[PDB]
């Protein structure tokens, strides 16, 4: 199973990725701008509510 060089190569490279992931590695500002735009469209589709605010409607009657 280890004889195939490519499998072990990918394995070790991903291992290195995991250790370097102590923090996420190689974001790059492009990453941040993409996050910005996609989160913006997501929230705009959803709304302007808080991250985790449990709201209420304050009902009424006819």
């Amino acid at each position: 199973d280890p004889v195939q060089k490519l499998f072990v190569d990918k394995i070790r490279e991903y291992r290195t990725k995991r250790q370097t992931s102590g923090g996420p590695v190689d974001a790059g500002p492009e990453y941040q701008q993409d996050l910005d735009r996609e989160l913006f469209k997501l929230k705009q589709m959803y709304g302007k509510a808080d991250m985790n605010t449990f709201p209420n409607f304050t009902f009424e009657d006819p």
């Binding site: 195939q4 490519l6 499998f7 990918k10 394995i11 992931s21």
Partner: protein, 495 residues
């Protein structure tokens, strides 16, 4: 994350000794491959770019290979590996609820198709012994289609009409209505719908899948989309892929329904393919083959007898006619292959009479056979009454003539329907009963629709016992007739 590393492991990397050929010339969507000495005809070769092609011509010095993708991803000098199997597609219940493209490659996300069996798109229709007459009813949930021009299981109806007259809507309502059967107890009434979209806008199919998911109708539907952008050799192949996914059920004792939409946009893809192969064009530039193309596809919508499983595969080809010319080439090619037809006028549609079935020309050549007895009782009278009304509607005297006009207008108003609103068989029976026996001749025609709505609300609310009696005993007994009569009279009283 590490899930991706596991994804790395278990990937087949073992190399194999495989025959190969070298592309000579790619252009017009037909590659000329050199080599491939032991390549079968209609085999599925694979290019170096992950594409697939069908080995069409075995010429002495080269192989014509029709590419199932964009021929811009194929150079000259590429490598073509024969996969050693006639063009195959994956089949099984693993596909239900999945939007696979013309070759079974899920274009849905939602992981891959976990199919374990493969069929040949180029199979042969069942002969003469396996087939048996059409016996069971295919409930479309549309009053006009279910009453006047019924359909059976094994029949291959046609839906023919102009641009935007409600062909796709009839197809979708038929698909949705099967939900009730696909939840009951007996596997003998479950229908596994399929829907082949050929040469259709991709956004249309996306919204159609969204609608089918809203109505919980994707538990059994398979959508095989070869949309407008996809190369012609994919729009030509999609119907055969779908028909194979349906033949699987048909041959395993189940019941399937396949809706090609449209078949007028497969024949155009085939005309492109042929003209680019330089084949001699015929009438309207279509190749002479353009019949065998549809005949071989629609002859598979069979109904196997009990000694062959007993399954069935209904087909509902959708043809689109320019300027409503029913006598064009492809419309007549298909009108002589199918067992019926539903003509959707474009002027009835523009009058708000929807669905726009032109009951004068629509017919079903199994018709009364494979129709619920109750619906037969109620709807034979309606067929005769509509016939009489049509015979005289060319001018608008005596008591009988005016009676025919009034009853016909009431029935026309009664047969209208709304989108995505299929009706159980018993509900159609009840409405058409209240219409034909004459409990509406005083109400204004303009109100006939509103009445209908309200009536349903009452019937479905209080007298579910009667409707269950009709459904179980598929017939209107005398006592059931009397109960329905008094129900209708009482409800109409409140007006």
């Amino acid at each position: 994350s590490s899930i991706l590393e596991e994804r790395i492991l278990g990937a087949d990397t073992s190399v194999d000794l495989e025959e190969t050929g070298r592309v000579l010339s790619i252009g017009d969507g037909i590659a000329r491959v050199h080599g491939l000495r032991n390549v079968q005809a209609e085999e599925m070769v694979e290019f170096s770019s992950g594409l697939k092609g069908m080995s069409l011509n075995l010429e002495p010095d080269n192989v014509g290979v029709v590419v199932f993708g964009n021929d811009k991803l194929i150079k000259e000098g590429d490598i073509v590996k024969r996969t050693g199997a006639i063009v195959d597609v994956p089949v099984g219940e693993e596909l239900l609820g999945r939007v696979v493209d013309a070759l079974g490659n899920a274009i849905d996300g939602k992981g891959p198709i976990g199919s374990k069996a493969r069929r040949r798109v180029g199979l042969k229709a069942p002969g003469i012994i396996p087939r048996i007459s059409v016996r069971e009813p295919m409930q479309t949930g549309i009053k006009a289609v279910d009453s006047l021009v019924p359909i059976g299981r094994g029949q291959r109806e046609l839906i023919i009409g102009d641009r935007q007259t409600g062909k796709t809507s009839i197809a979708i309502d038929t698909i949705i209505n099967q939900k009730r059967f696909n939840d009951g107890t007996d596997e003998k009434k479950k229908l596994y719908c399929i829907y082949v979209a050929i040469g259709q806008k991709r956004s249309t199919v996306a919204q159609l899948v969204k609608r089918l998911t809203d109505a919980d109708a994707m538990k059994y539907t398979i959508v095989v989309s070869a949309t407008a952008s996809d190369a012609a050799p994919l729009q030509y192949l999609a119907p055969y892929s779908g028909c194979s996914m349906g033949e699987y059920f048909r041959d395993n004792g189940k019941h399937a329904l396949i809706i090609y939409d449209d078949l007028s946009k497969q024949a155009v893809a085939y005309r492109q393919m042929s003209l680019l192969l330089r084949r001699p064009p015929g009438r309207e530039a279509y190749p002479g083959d353009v019949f065998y193309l549809h005949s071989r596809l629609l002859e598979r919508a069979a109904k196997m007898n009990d000694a062959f499983g007993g399954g069935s595969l209904t087909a509902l080809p959708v043809i689109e006619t320019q300027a409503g010319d029913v006598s064009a080439y492809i419309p007549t090619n298909v009108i002589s292959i199918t067992d019926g037809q539903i003509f959707l006028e474009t002027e009835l549609f523009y009058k708000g009479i929807r669905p726009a079935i032109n009951v004068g020309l629509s017919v079903s050549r199994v018709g009364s056979a494979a129709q619920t007895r109750a619906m037969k009782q109620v709807a034979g009278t309606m067929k005769l009454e509509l016939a009489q009304y049509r015979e005289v509607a060319a001018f608008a005297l005596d008591a009988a003539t005016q009676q025919l006009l009034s009853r016909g207008v009431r029935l026309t108003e009664l047969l209208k329907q709304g989108q995505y609103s299929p009706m159980a068989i018993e509900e159609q029976v009840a409405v058409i009963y209240a219409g034909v026996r004459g409990y509406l001749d005083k109400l204004e025609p303009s109100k006939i629709t509103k009445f209908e709505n309200a009536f349903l609300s009452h019937v479905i609310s209080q007298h579910q016992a009667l409707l269950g009696k009709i459904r179980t005993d598929g017939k209107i007994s005398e006592e059931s007739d009397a109960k329905l009569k008094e129900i209708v009279t009482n409800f109409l009283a409140g007006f």
